[PDB]
Amino acid sequence: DLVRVERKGRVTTVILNRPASRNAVNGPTAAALCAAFEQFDRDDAASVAVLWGAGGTFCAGADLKAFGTPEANSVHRTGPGPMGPSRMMLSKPVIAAVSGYAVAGGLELALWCDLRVAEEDAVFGVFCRRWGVPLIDGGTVRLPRLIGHSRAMDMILTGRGVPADEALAMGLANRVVPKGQARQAAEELAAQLAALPQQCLRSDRLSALHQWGLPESAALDLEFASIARVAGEALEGAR
Amino acid sequence: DLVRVERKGRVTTVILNRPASRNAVNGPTAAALCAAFEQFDRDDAASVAVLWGAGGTFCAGADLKAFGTPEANSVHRTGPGPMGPSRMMLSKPVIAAVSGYAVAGGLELALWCDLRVAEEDAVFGVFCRRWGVPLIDGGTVRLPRLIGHSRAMDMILTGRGVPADEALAMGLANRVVPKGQARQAAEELAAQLAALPQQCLRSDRLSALHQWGLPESAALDLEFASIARV
Amino acid sequence: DLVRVERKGRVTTVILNRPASRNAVNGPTAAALCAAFEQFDRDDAASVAVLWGAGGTFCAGADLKAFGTPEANSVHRTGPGPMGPSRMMLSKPVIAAVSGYAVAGGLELALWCDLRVAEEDAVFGVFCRRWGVPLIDGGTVRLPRLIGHSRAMDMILTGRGVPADEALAMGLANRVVPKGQARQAAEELAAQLAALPQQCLRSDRLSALHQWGLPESAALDLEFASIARVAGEALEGARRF
Numbered sequence: 001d002l003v004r005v006e007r008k009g010r011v012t013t014v015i016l017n018r019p020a021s022r023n024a025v026n027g028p029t030a031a032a033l034c035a036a037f038e039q040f041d042r043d044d045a046a047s048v049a050v051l052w053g054a055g056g057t058f059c060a061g062a063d064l065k066a067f068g069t070p071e072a073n074s075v076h077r078t079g080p081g082p083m084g085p086s087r088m089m090l091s092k093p094v095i096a097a098v099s100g101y102a103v104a105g106g107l108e109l110a111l112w113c114d115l116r117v118a119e120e121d122a123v124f125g126v127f128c129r130r131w132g133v134p135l136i137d138g139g140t141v142r143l144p145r146l147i148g149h150s151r152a153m154d155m156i157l158t159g160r161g162v163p164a165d166e167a168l169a170m171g172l173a174n175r176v177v178p179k180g181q182a183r184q185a186a187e188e189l190a191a192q193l194a195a196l197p198q199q200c201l202r203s204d205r206l207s208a209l210h211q212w213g214l215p216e217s218a219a220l221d222l223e224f225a226s227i228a229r230v231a232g233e234a235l236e237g238a239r
Numbered sequence: 240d241l242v243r244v245e246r247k248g249r250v251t252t253v254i255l256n257r258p259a260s261r262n263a264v265n266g267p268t269a270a271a272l273c274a275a276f277e278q279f280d281r282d283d284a285a286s287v288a289v290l291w292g293a294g295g296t297f298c299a300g301a302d303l304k305a306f307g308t309p310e311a312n313s314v315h316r317t318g319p320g321p322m323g324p325s326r327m328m329l330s331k332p333v334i335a336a337v338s339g340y341a342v343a344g345g346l347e348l349a350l351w352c353d354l355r356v357a358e359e360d361a362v363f364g365v366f367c368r369r370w371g372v373p374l375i376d377g378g379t380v381r382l383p384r385l386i387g388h389s390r391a392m393d394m395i396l397t398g399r400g401v402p403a404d405e406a407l408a409m410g411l412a413n414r415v416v417p418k419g420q421a422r423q424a425a426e427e428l429a430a431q432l433a434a435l436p437q438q439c440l441r442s443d444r445l446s447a448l449h450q451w452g453l454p455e456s457a458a459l460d461l462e463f464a465s466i467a468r469v
Numbered sequence: 470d471l472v473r474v475e476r477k478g479r480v481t482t483v484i485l486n487r488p489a490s491r492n493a494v495n496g497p498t499a500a501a502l503c504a505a506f507e508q509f510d511r512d513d514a515a516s517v518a519v520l521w522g523a524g525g526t527f528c529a530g531a532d533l534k535a536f537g538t539p540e541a542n543s544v545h546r547t548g549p550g551p552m553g554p555s556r557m558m559l560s561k562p563v564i565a566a567v568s569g570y571a572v573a574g575g576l577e578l579a580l581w582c583d584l585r586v587a588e589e590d591a592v593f594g595v596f597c598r599r600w601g602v603p604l605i606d607g608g609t610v611r612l613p614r615l616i617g618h619s620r621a622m623d624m625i626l627t628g629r630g631v632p633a634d635e636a637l638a639m640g641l642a643n644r645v646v647p648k649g650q651a652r653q654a655a656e657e658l659a660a661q662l663a664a665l666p667q668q669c670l671r672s673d674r675l676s677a678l679h680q681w682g683l684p685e686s687a688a689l690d691l692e693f694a695s696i697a698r699v700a701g702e703a704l705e706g707a708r709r710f
Contacts, residue, residue: 075466087459093626114622129443132436134465140446141458146619149447150385150410153353156443157332157432170410171620171639193626197601204598204625207609208618213454215682219610220556224546226603237600238536303710316693326689368673371666371706373695379676380688388677389615389640392583395673396562396662409640452684 258294488524
C-alpha cells in the first residue's frame with residue numbers, strides 16, 4: 001500500500017511506497033504518514049524512527065498529478081500539513097534515510113527529520129521552484145536554521161540540486177554512506193540512540209528545537225526544566 | 240554618475256561608480272543607491288537586481304573623509320541607513336557581484352543582498368573594527384544569521400579579512416568565479432532566477448527572511464500564507 | 470586552589486585547576502568561576518578574558534562524584550547556573566583555550582565563550598548523553614546558534630566526540646593550534662582584541678548576541694544604538710580619514 005511501518009526493537013521505520021511516482025505524496029499518503037508518526041509518538045516501546053523511501057528515491061514532493069482530484073493534498077491552516085507530518089513536533093527523534101532525490105516537499109520532510117543520512121548519489125533540492133508550487137511544509141523555516149540563511153537562500157532561490165557531498169559540507173547531510181546503504185546506516189544510528197538514556201536525550205532535543213525564536217533568557221529557562229523532567233534518570237547517572 | 244543603473248531584460252544592475260574612493264559611499268551616493276533600489280522594487284518589469292562595484296572593487300564602506308562636510312553619510316534612527324538601502328526589505332532579490340574588497344559598510348551591503356558571487360581574489364571583512372566605527376547597517380544582525388554565530392563572532396571581533404575561498408567554505412560567498420567575472424556571473428544567475436515562476440520565488444524568499452525571530456510554530460503559520468498569495 | 474586568576478597586560482586568564490578530576494566543576498569551583506568573571510566584568514584594566522583548564526584538559530563538566538556532598542553543584546533556576554558563569558552576559562569577550570576534552574558542562578562553558586581556540590588533539594562532545602545527565606548550562610541553546618541546527622542535533626543526540634579538525638570545519642573551533650599551545654595562542658589572540666578600539670568592539674559583540682530571536686527591523690534598531698554608545702570613539706575614528 002502507500003506507507004509501511006516496520007519495527008525492530010525500539011526502532012520504527014516508516015516507509016514511503018509509491019515508487020511509480022518517485023514517492024510523491026498525495027492526500028491519502030500524507031494521511032498514512034501522519035497516522036504512522038502519531039502512532040510512533042504514543043508508542044512507549046518505540047524510541048527512534050527512521051523515515052525511508054523505498055524504490056531508490058526518498059520523496060519527490062507533492063503528487064502534482066493528483067491536483068484537483070479527490071486524492072489531492074489537503075491544504076488547511078490547522079491539522080496536518082500538506083506533506084503529512086511536517087507540522088508535528090514529535091516527542092522522539094526521526095532519522096531521514098535519504099536515497100536518490102529528496103526534493104520539494106520531499107526535501108521538507110527530510111528537513112523535518114532530526115538527522116539526515118544520505119547515500120553518495122543523493123540529491124537535495126527545492127525543485128518546486130521550477131514549477132511555481134510554494135514551500136508550505138516548513139522548508140523556508142527549517143532550511144535557514146539548519147544550514148544558515150546564505151546557503152538556504154541559494155537553495156531556495158535557484159531550486160538547484162545539491163549533491164550529497166556538497167550537502168555534507170553544508171551540514172545539510174549529517175552522514176554520507178554508499179548507494180543503497182542509507183536505510184541500514186540510519187537504522188544502526190537509530191539503535192545506537194535507542195540504547196542511550198532516553199529522557200535526557202529527549203528533553204535535550206526538544207530544548208534545541210524550541211530555543212529557535214526565543215531570547216536566550218527564556219531559552220535557558222526552558223532548557224533548565226530538563227533537570228526536573230529527567231531527575232529519576234540523572235540520579236541513576238551520578239551513581 | 241555616483242551610481243549607474245543598467246537593465247538587460249528583467250535584470251537591473253545597480254553600479255557603484257566611485258572607483259577612485261574604492262567605492263566608498265558618502266551621503267549622496269547612499270541616497271542614489273536608495274533611489275535605484277526603490278525604483279527596482281516598484282518596477283513591475285524588473286525581477287532581479289545585481290549590485291556591483293565598478294573598477295575592480297565592491298565597496299569599502301562609508302566615506303569617512305566626507306565626515307564633517309555636506310557630503311557626509313546621514314545617520315538617523317529612521318529612514319535610510321547610512322550606507323543607503325541596508326534597512327530595506329525588498330519584494331525581490333538582489334545578487335551582490337563582489338570583486339576586490341567588500342569591507343565595513345561594504346560588507347554590510349553585501350550581506351544585505353540575497354546571494355553573493357565573489358571573484359577568487361575578493362576579500363570580505365569587518366574592517367571598521369580597526370578604525371573604531373560601528374556596524375550600524377545590519378552586519379551584526381545579518382552575519383550571524385548567514386553563517387552562524389561562531390564564525391560571525393570571529394569576523395566581527397577580529398575584523399580579519401576573509402578571502403573568497405574561506406568565504407565559500409563558511410557559506411558567506413555563494414559562488415566563487417575568476418577575476419573580472421563577478422558581474423557577468425551574477426547577471427547570468429540573475430537571468431536564471433528571472434526565468435522561474437516569480438510569485439512563488441518571492442514568497443518563499445520573504446518567508447525565509449521573516450522566520451528568523453519567530454519560534455517554529457508561529458513561523459510555520461506565517462509561511463502557510465504563501466498558499467494565499469501565489 | 471580550585472580556580473586561579475592571572476593577569477597579563479589587558480588579558481585576564483581564568484584557570485580551572487583540578488586536573489586530577491579532569492577539571493570537573495563542583496559547587497565551590499563554580500562559585501569561584503563566577504566570582505572571577507564578575508570581577509573581570511568590572512575591572513577597567515582588563516579587556517578580554519581567556520578560560521583555560523590546567524594540566525592537559527579543558528573541563529569534563531559537572532563533578533558527579535560530589536552529588537550528595539556539601540560540594541555538590543548548585544542547581545537553581547535563577548542566579549548562577551550549575552557550571553558557574555554560563556548564564557552571564559559579560560560586557561567583554563572571553564576566549565576558550567581548549568586542550569584535551571571539553572565535554573558535557575565543559576562543552577557548555579566553551580560554547581558560552583565568544584571564540585574557541587582548540588589544540589589539534591582536543592575533543593568536544595556532549596558526553597553527558599552517555600550518563601543520562603541533561604544539558605542545563607545553555608548547550609541546547611548555544612550550539613544550534615553557533616553551528617546550525619543540523620550539526621548541533623548530531624552532536625546533541627549522539628554524544629559523539631568531535632575532534633578539533635572536524636570542529637574547525639563545522640565552525641565550532643575558530644582556531645586550531647598545536648598541542649600545548651591553546652593557552653598561549655588564546656592569550657595572544659586576546660591581546661589582539663584588546664588592542665582594537667574597545668567601544669565599537671564591545672557594542673558590536675553585544676548587538677550580535679541580542680539580535681537572536683528578533684525580527685530584522687527591531688534587531689536593526691538595537692544595533693543602531695551603538696552609535697550613541699560609541700559616539701566619542703566613532704568621532705575619533707572619523708577624524709583619522
